Amino acid sequence: ADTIDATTRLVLRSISERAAVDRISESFGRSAQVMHDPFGGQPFPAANSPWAPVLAPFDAETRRVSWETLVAHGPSLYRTFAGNPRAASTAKAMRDCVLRQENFIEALASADETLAWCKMCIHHNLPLRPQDPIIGTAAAVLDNLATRLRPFLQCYLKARGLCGLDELCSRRRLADIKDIASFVFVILARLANRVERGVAEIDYATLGVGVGEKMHFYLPGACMAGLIEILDTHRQECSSRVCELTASHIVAPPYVHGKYFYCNSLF
């Protein structure tokens, strides 16, 4: 008979013996100290570089680049990442966390950031590497967008006649991509899978890109533009009030209702 075993029950109750406001304060205190100098002795090199401000709140308009600017200046940033492996490792880990807690609009922007970066890599024939901080955090954007979009996609993907979110990200087949939602999820799932596998160089085909091809089907900004559009226009084809609430509240996140109480017996 499936049961929580006797010993684990003791383990579970014993949190009560240790949990305390000052033990928690000293925890926030130790993790905060790690975040004070997270690169330690090894930050990315001081240099005169248009990338200096992001190599040291990120402001999208101030940090904005045209596609043409990314193609001209992207290789410099790429060489910085690859040529500073300790720094890139620290960056990767911090990027992974940031992207796992980003709001919806930020998470769209990060999907485009990741795909535009790969498109730039492809443009220059640069390999797509697991250690690259942008490529290697594909799973973070992926999981963030899955969390936030799942109940809406349950409805929308049925309306499109497509596989559900989990089957999409499980099969990971280019031939399943039929719209922008399947595109963002299938491509990011393929890319996250090849990262987790730790292939030294990730095949352009992972992105649906063939030999000598350039990814003409992906325009930078398409994840943002297209997913916001479907959150908007699906309600025209869908008679569910709950779905409409879901889509609306994704687009307009200020808190209104939904939280009832806080109960903490331990501290």
* CA separation for the pair 215, 194 (Å, rounded): 18
Task: Give yes or no for residue 153 binding Zn ion (CB under 5 A).
Answer: no
Backbone conformation region of residue 140, classed left if phi is above 0, alpha if psi is from -120 to 50, else beta = alpha
- CA angle 27–30–33, rounded 5-degree value: 145
Euclidean distance between CA atoms 208 and 189, whole angstroms: 12
CB of 75 to a second copy, least distance (A): 13
Is the CB of residue 122 less than 8 Å from the CB of residue 215? yes
Q: Tell me how far, at minimum, the Cβ of 177 lies from a second copy, in Å.
A: 5
Q: How many CB atoms lie within 10 A of CB 126?
A: 18
Query: Is residue 155 near Zn ion by the rule CB under 5 A?
Result: yes
Nearer to a second copy, 83 or 253 (CB): 253
CB of 246 to Zn ion, least distance (A): 8
Cβ 240 to a second copy, closest distance in Å?
Answer: 10
Residue 159 or 266 having the CB closest to a second copy: 266
From the list Zn ion, a second copy, none, pick the one residue 136 interacts with, judged by a Cβ distance below 5 to 8 Å according to partner type. none
Q: Which does 199 bind (CB under 5 to 8 A by kind): Zn ion, a second copy, none?
A: none
Please give the Cα distance from 186 to 170 (Å, whole number): 9
| Rounded Cα gap, residues 38 and 40, in angstroms | 5
Q: How far is it, in rounded angstroms, from Cα 183 to Cα 1? A: 43
Q: Judged by CB under 5 A, does residue 162 bind Zn ion?
A: no
Q: Under rule CB under 5 A, which residues in 217-246 are in contact with Zn ion?
A: 238, 240, 243
Smallest gap from residue 215 Cβ to Zn ion (A):
31
Cα 169 from chain centre: 14
Minimal distance in Å, beta carbon 228 to a second copy?
Answer: 6
Contacted by 212, from Zn ion, a second copy, none: CB < 5 to 8 Å by type: none
> Which one of Zn ion, a second copy, none interacts with residue 155, CB within 5 to 8 A by kind?
Zn ion
Task: State the binding partner of 238 from Zn ion, a second copy, none, CB within 5 to 8 A by kind.
Answer: Zn ion
Choose among a second copy, Zn ion, none what residue 35 binds, the Cβ cut-off being 5 to 8 Å by kind. Answer: a second copy
**Nearest-approach distance from CB 200 to a second copy, in angstroms:** 19
Residue 29, CB-side half-sphere exposure with 13 Å CA sphere: 6
3-class DSSP state of 252? coil
164-203 binders of Zn ion (CB under 5 A): none
108, 210 Cβ separation under 8 angstroms: no
Closest to Zn ion by CB, 153 vs 202, is 153
Query: For residues 64 and 162, what is the distance between their CA atoms, to the nearest angstrom?
Result: 34
- The total number of residues written for the chain in this structure: 267
Question: Binding residues for Zn ion, how many (CB under 5 A)?
Answer: 4
Interface with Zn ion (CB under 5 A): 155, 238, 240, 243
